[PDB]
Amino acid sequence: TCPFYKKIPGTGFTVDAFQYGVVEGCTAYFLTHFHSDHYAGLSKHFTFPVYCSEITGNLLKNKLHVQEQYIHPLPLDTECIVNGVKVVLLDANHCPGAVMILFYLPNGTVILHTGDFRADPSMERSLLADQKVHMLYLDTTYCSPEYTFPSQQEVIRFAINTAFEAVTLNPHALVVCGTYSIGKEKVFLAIADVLGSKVGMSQEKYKTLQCLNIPEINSLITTDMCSSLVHLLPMMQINFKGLQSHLKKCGGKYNQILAFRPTGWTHSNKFTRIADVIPQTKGNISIYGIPYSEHSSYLEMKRFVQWLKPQKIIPTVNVGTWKSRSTMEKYFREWKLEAGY
Ligand code: NI
């Protein structure tokens, strides 16, 4: 049965609610983004209307085989009527195709559902600027002050400089980057661009990347592993055993691997600056964990919410424990008292 924080009151609508069977009263199912915890339940046998971005719709059709007649793509930044209710999709600064949804309820209430997002000051000049929001359904993944990490631009700077230095010292080194979902494509694209290489990958991953509307993608990626000196591998293979096994397969072309694991936050963030990060090394293999986040830091979250001044907040992450729920409610009240709303 579908939980309350996935229902939009006063509508026939749900958000990211595909794993509960037929939801009673649901006339339209919104999907914020193509991440498995959110699409869990969709398949080619689904027969209700799905509303989403163009990119998410490309992924539903090609990767999950949802039939075309049930896919309803909407443009961003555009007032649209769905089943008699005005909605707007906004870029969530998460993975490709991810959106926030603004719902203008028939009784005058305005609701923002952030989906998964990385708050940014640029959102203060979207269509959010123009009116009041009564209820906020909020991605609270990192809602605690210990969660600090650098900008995405600082992280990419570190990765490009690390890769370029290593491969210029040793032209026979291979760079490997882990992946297990869409998102974080800048990591491998930026490294390949500095090295003058295409990115090599499996047929299944190439297919996924071809759904993303990335400009000039055919110039950037390939299934021909032999031609490429940046390879993508599943995240589970980014360890000494997996990388040894991969280097064997390269036919003595390479004699060293430098690998990256983009993670979210890890506790080494509470001590170490990005500049000071060091790898784990065994022989001719080195592995860097880099804190490339597609979710808000605590400070970015707090800034956004203090700017929006919502009347009520409904968390959508960390909702399973009383300790989590109580911690999150305490910060919401601090934020409201400090800013005066
Ligand atoms: Ni996500």
CSV table of C-alpha atoms and ligand atoms in Angstrom, one decimal:
chain,number,residue,atom,x,y,z
A,1,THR,CA,0.0,0.0,0.0
A,2,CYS,CA,1.1,3.5,-1.1
A,3,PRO,CA,2.5,5.8,1.7
A,4,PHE,CA,1.0,9.2,2.4
A,5,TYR,CA,4.1,11.2,1.4
A,6,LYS,CA,3.6,9.8,-2.3
A,7,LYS,CA,0.1,11.1,-2.6
A,8,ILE,CA,-0.9,14.6,-3.7
A,9,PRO,CA,-4.1,15.6,-1.9
A,10,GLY,CA,-7.0,17.0,-3.9
A,11,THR,CA,-5.9,15.3,-7.1
A,12,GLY,CA,-5.9,12.0,-8.7
A,13,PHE,CA,-2.0,12.0,-8.7
A,14,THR,CA,0.9,10.0,-7.2
A,15,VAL,CA,4.6,10.6,-7.3
A,16,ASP,CA,7.2,7.8,-7.7
A,17,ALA,CA,4.6,5.2,-6.7
A,18,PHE,CA,4.9,2.2,-9.1
A,19,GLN,CA,5.5,-0.7,-6.6
A,20,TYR,CA,2.1,-0.8,-4.9
A,21,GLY,CA,0.0,-2.2,-7.8
A,22,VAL,CA,-3.1,-0.2,-8.8
A,23,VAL,CA,-3.4,2.8,-6.4
A,24,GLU,CA,-7.1,3.5,-5.6
A,25,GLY,CA,-8.1,6.8,-7.2
A,26,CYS,CA,-4.9,7.4,-9.2
A,27,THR,CA,-5.6,8.8,-12.7
A,28,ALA,CA,-2.0,9.9,-13.4
A,29,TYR,CA,1.4,8.5,-12.1
A,30,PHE,CA,4.3,11.0,-12.1
A,31,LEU,CA,7.9,9.8,-12.3
A,32,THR,CA,10.5,12.4,-11.2
A,33,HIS,CA,13.6,10.5,-12.6
A,34,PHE,CA,15.0,7.2,-13.8
A,35,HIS,CA,16.5,5.8,-10.6
A,36,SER,CA,15.5,2.3,-9.5
A,37,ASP,CA,14.2,3.1,-6.0
A,38,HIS,CA,11.7,5.6,-7.8
A,39,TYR,CA,10.7,3.6,-10.8
A,40,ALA,CA,10.4,0.2,-8.8
A,41,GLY,CA,7.5,-1.6,-10.3
A,42,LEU,CA,7.3,-0.2,-13.9
A,43,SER,CA,7.6,-2.7,-16.8
A,44,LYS,CA,6.2,-3.2,-20.4
A,45,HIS,CA,2.9,-4.5,-18.9
A,46,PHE,CA,2.1,-1.1,-17.2
A,47,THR,CA,-1.3,0.3,-18.6
A,48,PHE,CA,-1.8,3.7,-16.7
A,49,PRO,CA,-0.6,7.2,-17.9
A,50,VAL,CA,2.9,8.1,-16.8
A,51,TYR,CA,3.9,11.8,-16.8
A,52,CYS,CA,7.6,12.7,-16.9
A,53,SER,CA,10.4,14.5,-18.7
A,54,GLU,CA,11.4,13.8,-22.4
A,55,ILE,CA,14.6,12.1,-21.2
A,56,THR,CA,12.9,9.9,-18.6
A,57,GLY,CA,10.3,8.9,-21.3
A,58,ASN,CA,13.2,7.8,-23.6
A,59,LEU,CA,14.5,5.6,-20.8
A,60,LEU,CA,11.1,4.1,-20.0
A,61,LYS,CA,10.5,3.2,-23.7
A,62,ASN,CA,14.0,1.8,-24.5
A,63,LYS,CA,15.2,0.3,-21.3
A,64,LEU,CA,12.0,-0.8,-19.5
A,65,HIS,CA,9.8,-1.2,-22.8
A,66,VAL,CA,6.9,0.6,-21.5
A,67,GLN,CA,4.5,1.1,-24.4
A,68,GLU,CA,4.5,4.4,-26.1
A,69,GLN,CA,0.8,5.0,-25.7
A,70,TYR,CA,1.2,5.2,-21.8
A,71,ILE,CA,4.3,7.6,-21.9
A,72,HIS,CA,3.4,11.4,-21.5
A,73,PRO,CA,6.5,13.6,-21.8
A,74,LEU,CA,6.2,17.3,-20.8
A,75,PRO,CA,8.5,20.1,-21.6
A,76,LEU,CA,10.3,22.0,-18.8
A,77,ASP,CA,9.5,25.5,-17.5
A,78,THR,CA,6.0,25.4,-19.2
A,79,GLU,CA,2.5,25.6,-17.7
A,80,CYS,CA,0.7,22.3,-18.7
A,81,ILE,CA,-2.9,21.0,-17.8
A,82,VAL,CA,-3.0,17.4,-16.7
A,83,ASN,CA,-6.5,15.9,-15.9
A,84,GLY,CA,-7.8,19.4,-15.2
A,85,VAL,CA,-4.9,20.6,-13.0
A,86,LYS,CA,-2.1,23.1,-13.9
A,87,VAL,CA,1.5,21.6,-13.4
A,88,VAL,CA,5.0,22.7,-14.2
A,89,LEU,CA,8.2,20.6,-14.4
A,90,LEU,CA,11.5,22.2,-13.3
A,91,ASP,CA,15.1,20.9,-13.6
A,92,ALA,CA,16.1,19.2,-10.3
A,93,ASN,CA,19.9,19.5,-10.8
A,94,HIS,CA,20.1,15.7,-10.0
A,95,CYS,CA,20.7,13.1,-12.9
A,96,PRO,CA,19.7,13.6,-16.6
A,97,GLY,CA,16.0,14.0,-17.0
A,98,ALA,CA,15.3,14.6,-13.2
A,99,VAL,CA,12.5,17.1,-12.4
A,100,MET,CA,10.8,18.8,-9.5
A,101,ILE,CA,6.9,19.2,-10.0
A,102,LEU,CA,4.8,22.3,-9.1
A,103,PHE,CA,1.1,21.4,-8.6
A,104,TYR,CA,-1.5,24.3,-8.6
A,105,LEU,CA,-4.5,22.7,-6.8
A,106,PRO,CA,-8.1,23.5,-7.7
A,107,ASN,CA,-8.6,25.0,-4.1
A,108,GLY,CA,-5.7,27.5,-4.4
A,109,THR,CA,-3.0,25.5,-2.6
A,110,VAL,CA,0.4,25.3,-4.3
A,111,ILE,CA,2.6,22.2,-3.7
A,112,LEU,CA,6.3,21.7,-4.8
A,113,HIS,CA,7.6,18.1,-4.9
A,114,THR,CA,11.4,18.2,-5.3
A,115,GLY,CA,11.9,14.6,-6.3
A,116,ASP,CA,15.7,14.0,-5.7
A,117,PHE,CA,17.5,17.4,-6.1
A,118,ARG,CA,20.7,19.3,-5.5
A,119,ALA,CA,19.6,22.7,-4.4
A,120,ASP,CA,21.2,25.7,-6.1
A,121,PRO,CA,20.8,29.5,-6.0
A,122,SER,CA,19.9,29.4,-9.6
A,123,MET,CA,16.5,27.9,-8.5
A,124,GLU,CA,15.6,31.2,-6.8
A,125,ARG,CA,15.2,32.6,-10.4
A,126,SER,CA,13.1,29.9,-11.9
A,127,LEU,CA,9.3,30.0,-12.1
A,128,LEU,CA,9.4,29.5,-8.3
A,129,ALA,CA,10.1,33.2,-7.8
A,130,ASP,CA,6.6,34.2,-8.9
A,131,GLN,CA,4.4,32.7,-6.1
A,132,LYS,CA,3.9,31.3,-2.7
A,133,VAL,CA,4.3,27.5,-1.9
A,134,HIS,CA,2.1,26.1,0.9
A,135,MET,CA,3.5,22.5,1.0
A,136,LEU,CA,7.1,21.2,0.2
A,137,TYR,CA,7.7,17.5,-0.3
A,138,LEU,CA,11.5,17.6,0.3
A,139,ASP,CA,14.6,15.4,-0.6
A,140,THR,CA,16.1,15.2,2.9
A,141,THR,CA,18.9,12.7,2.0
A,142,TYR,CA,21.6,14.8,3.7
A,143,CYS,CA,19.5,16.8,6.3
A,144,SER,CA,22.2,16.9,9.1
A,145,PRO,CA,25.1,19.4,9.5
A,146,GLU,CA,27.8,16.7,9.3
A,147,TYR,CA,27.0,16.3,5.7
A,148,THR,CA,29.5,18.5,3.9
A,149,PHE,CA,31.1,17.9,0.5
A,150,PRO,CA,32.7,20.2,-2.2
A,151,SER,CA,31.1,21.7,-5.4
A,152,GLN,CA,30.8,19.4,-8.4
A,153,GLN,CA,33.2,21.9,-10.3
A,154,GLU,CA,36.0,21.4,-7.6
A,155,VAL,CA,35.5,17.6,-7.7
A,156,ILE,CA,35.8,17.5,-11.5
A,157,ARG,CA,38.9,19.8,-11.3
A,158,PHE,CA,40.6,17.3,-9.0
A,159,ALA,CA,39.7,14.3,-11.3
A,160,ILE,CA,40.8,15.9,-14.6
A,161,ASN,CA,44.2,17.1,-13.0
A,162,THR,CA,44.8,13.6,-11.4
A,163,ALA,CA,44.1,11.7,-14.6
A,164,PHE,CA,46.0,14.1,-16.9
A,165,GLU,CA,49.1,14.0,-14.6
A,166,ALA,CA,49.1,10.1,-14.3
A,167,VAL,CA,48.7,9.4,-18.0
A,168,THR,CA,51.3,12.1,-19.1
A,169,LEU,CA,53.8,10.4,-16.7
A,170,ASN,CA,52.8,7.0,-18.1
A,171,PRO,CA,51.2,6.8,-21.6
A,172,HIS,CA,50.5,3.1,-20.9
A,173,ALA,CA,48.2,3.8,-18.0
A,174,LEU,CA,44.4,3.0,-18.4
A,175,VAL,CA,41.7,5.1,-16.6
A,176,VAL,CA,38.6,3.2,-15.3
A,177,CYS,CA,35.5,4.9,-13.9
A,178,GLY,CA,32.7,3.0,-12.0
A,179,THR,CA,28.9,3.4,-12.7
A,180,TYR,CA,25.6,1.7,-11.5
A,181,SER,CA,22.9,4.1,-12.6
A,182,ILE,CA,22.5,7.3,-14.7
A,183,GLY,CA,23.9,10.4,-13.1
A,184,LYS,CA,27.5,11.7,-12.6
A,185,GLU,CA,28.3,11.4,-16.4
A,186,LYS,CA,30.5,14.6,-16.1
A,187,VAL,CA,33.2,12.5,-14.2
A,188,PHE,CA,34.0,10.2,-17.1
A,189,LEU,CA,33.2,12.8,-19.9
A,190,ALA,CA,35.6,15.4,-18.4
A,191,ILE,CA,38.5,12.9,-17.9
A,192,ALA,CA,38.1,11.5,-21.5
A,193,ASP,CA,38.0,15.1,-22.9
A,194,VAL,CA,41.3,16.1,-21.2
A,195,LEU,CA,43.0,12.8,-22.5
A,196,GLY,CA,41.7,13.2,-26.1
A,197,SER,CA,39.8,9.9,-25.9
A,198,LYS,CA,36.3,8.5,-26.4
A,199,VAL,CA,34.8,6.7,-23.4
A,200,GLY,CA,34.5,2.9,-23.9
A,201,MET,CA,31.7,0.9,-22.4
A,202,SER,CA,29.4,-2.1,-22.8
A,203,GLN,CA,26.5,-2.2,-25.3
A,204,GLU,CA,23.9,-2.0,-22.4
A,205,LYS,CA,25.6,1.2,-21.0
A,206,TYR,CA,26.0,2.8,-24.4
A,207,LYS,CA,22.2,2.2,-25.0
A,208,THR,CA,21.4,4.0,-21.8
A,209,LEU,CA,23.6,7.0,-22.6
A,210,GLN,CA,22.0,7.3,-26.1
A,211,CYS,CA,18.6,8.1,-24.4
A,212,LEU,CA,20.0,11.2,-22.6
A,213,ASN,CA,20.0,14.0,-25.2
A,214,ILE,CA,23.6,14.9,-24.5
A,215,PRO,CA,24.9,17.2,-27.3
A,216,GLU,CA,27.4,15.6,-29.7
A,217,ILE,CA,27.3,12.3,-27.7
A,218,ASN,CA,28.3,10.3,-30.8
A,219,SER,CA,31.6,12.2,-30.7
A,220,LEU,CA,32.2,11.2,-27.0
A,221,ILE,CA,31.4,7.5,-26.4
A,222,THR,CA,32.0,4.1,-28.0
A,223,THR,CA,31.5,0.3,-27.7
A,224,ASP,CA,35.0,-0.3,-29.2
A,225,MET,CA,37.0,-0.7,-26.0
A,226,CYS,CA,40.3,-1.2,-27.8
A,227,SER,CA,40.2,2.3,-29.3
A,228,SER,CA,39.5,4.0,-25.9
A,229,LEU,CA,41.8,4.8,-22.9
A,230,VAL,CA,38.9,5.6,-20.5
A,231,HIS,CA,36.7,2.6,-19.8
A,232,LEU,CA,33.5,2.3,-17.8
A,233,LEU,CA,32.8,-0.7,-15.6
A,234,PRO,CA,30.0,-1.6,-13.2
A,235,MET,CA,30.7,-0.1,-9.7
A,236,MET,CA,31.0,-3.6,-8.2
A,237,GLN,CA,34.1,-4.3,-10.3
A,238,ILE,CA,35.9,-1.2,-8.9
A,239,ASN,CA,38.2,-3.2,-6.5
A,240,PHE,CA,41.7,-4.8,-6.8
A,241,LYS,CA,40.4,-8.2,-7.9
A,242,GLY,CA,38.0,-6.8,-10.5
A,243,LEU,CA,40.5,-4.3,-12.0
A,244,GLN,CA,43.3,-7.0,-12.2
A,245,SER,CA,40.9,-9.1,-14.1
A,246,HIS,CA,40.0,-6.3,-16.4
A,247,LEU,CA,43.8,-5.4,-17.1
A,248,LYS,CA,44.4,-9.0,-18.3
A,249,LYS,CA,41.7,-8.6,-20.9
A,250,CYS,CA,43.4,-5.6,-22.5
A,251,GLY,CA,46.0,-7.7,-24.4
A,252,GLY,CA,49.2,-6.1,-22.9
A,253,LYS,CA,48.2,-2.6,-24.1
A,254,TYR,CA,48.4,-1.2,-20.6
A,255,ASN,CA,50.6,-1.7,-17.5
A,256,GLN,CA,48.8,0.4,-14.9
A,257,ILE,CA,45.2,1.3,-13.9
A,258,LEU,CA,44.0,4.5,-12.3
A,259,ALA,CA,40.3,4.1,-11.2
A,260,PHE,CA,37.6,6.4,-9.8
A,261,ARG,CA,34.6,5.6,-7.6
A,262,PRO,CA,32.2,8.4,-7.4
A,263,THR,CA,30.4,8.0,-4.2
A,264,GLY,CA,28.0,10.2,-2.3
A,265,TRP,CA,29.2,11.5,1.1
A,266,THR,CA,31.6,9.3,3.1
A,267,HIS,CA,32.9,10.0,6.8
A,268,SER,CA,36.4,10.8,5.3
A,269,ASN,CA,34.6,14.1,4.4
A,270,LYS,CA,34.6,15.1,8.1
A,271,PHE,CA,38.5,15.3,8.1
A,272,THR,CA,39.9,15.6,4.6
A,273,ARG,CA,39.8,18.4,2.0
A,274,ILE,CA,39.3,17.4,-1.7
A,275,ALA,CA,42.9,18.6,-2.5
A,276,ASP,CA,44.3,16.2,0.2
A,277,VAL,CA,42.5,13.0,-1.1
A,278,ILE,CA,44.7,10.0,-1.7
A,279,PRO,CA,44.0,6.7,-3.3
A,280,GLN,CA,44.1,3.1,-2.2
A,281,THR,CA,47.0,1.3,-4.0
A,282,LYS,CA,48.0,-2.3,-4.6
A,283,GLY,CA,50.9,-2.8,-7.0
A,284,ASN,CA,50.2,-1.1,-10.4
A,285,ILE,CA,46.5,-0.3,-9.4
A,286,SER,CA,45.2,2.9,-7.6
A,287,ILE,CA,41.6,3.6,-6.7
A,288,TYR,CA,40.3,7.1,-5.8
A,289,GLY,CA,36.9,7.6,-4.0
A,290,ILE,CA,35.7,11.0,-5.0
A,291,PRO,CA,32.6,12.8,-3.3
A,292,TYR,CA,30.6,13.8,-6.4
A,293,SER,CA,27.1,14.4,-5.0
A,294,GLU,CA,23.8,14.9,-6.9
A,295,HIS,CA,21.9,15.6,-3.6
A,296,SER,CA,21.9,18.9,-1.6
A,297,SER,CA,24.5,19.4,1.1
A,298,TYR,CA,22.9,20.5,4.4
A,299,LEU,CA,23.9,24.1,3.8
A,300,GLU,CA,22.5,24.1,0.2
A,301,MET,CA,19.2,22.6,1.5
A,302,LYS,CA,18.9,25.1,4.4
A,303,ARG,CA,19.4,28.0,2.0
A,304,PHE,CA,16.8,26.8,-0.4
A,305,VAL,CA,14.1,26.2,2.2
A,306,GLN,CA,14.8,29.5,4.0
A,307,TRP,CA,14.4,31.3,0.6
A,308,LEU,CA,11.1,29.4,-0.3
A,309,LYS,CA,9.5,29.8,3.1
A,310,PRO,CA,7.0,26.9,2.9
A,311,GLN,CA,4.1,26.7,5.3
A,312,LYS,CA,4.6,22.9,5.8
A,313,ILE,CA,7.5,20.4,5.0
A,314,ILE,CA,7.0,16.7,4.2
A,315,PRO,CA,10.3,14.8,4.1
A,316,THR,CA,10.6,12.0,1.4
A,317,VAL,CA,14.0,10.5,2.6
A,318,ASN,CA,15.0,9.1,6.0
A,319,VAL,CA,11.4,8.7,7.0
A,320,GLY,CA,11.7,5.1,8.5
A,321,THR,CA,13.0,5.8,12.1
A,322,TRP,CA,11.7,8.0,14.9
A,323,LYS,CA,15.2,9.4,15.5
A,324,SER,CA,15.5,10.5,11.8
A,325,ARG,CA,12.1,12.1,11.8
A,326,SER,CA,12.7,13.9,15.1
A,327,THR,CA,16.1,15.2,14.0
A,328,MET,CA,14.7,16.6,10.7
A,329,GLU,CA,11.7,18.3,12.5
A,330,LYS,CA,14.2,20.0,14.8
A,331,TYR,CA,16.2,21.5,11.9
A,332,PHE,CA,13.0,22.7,10.1
A,333,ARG,CA,12.0,24.6,13.3
A,334,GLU,CA,15.5,26.2,13.7
A,335,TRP,CA,15.4,27.3,10.1
A,336,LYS,CA,11.9,28.9,10.5
A,337,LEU,CA,12.9,30.7,13.7
A,338,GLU,CA,16.2,32.0,12.3
A,339,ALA,CA,14.6,33.4,9.1
A,340,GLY,CA,11.2,34.5,10.7
A,341,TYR,CA,8.6,32.8,8.6
B,1,NI,NI,17.9,9.7,-7.4
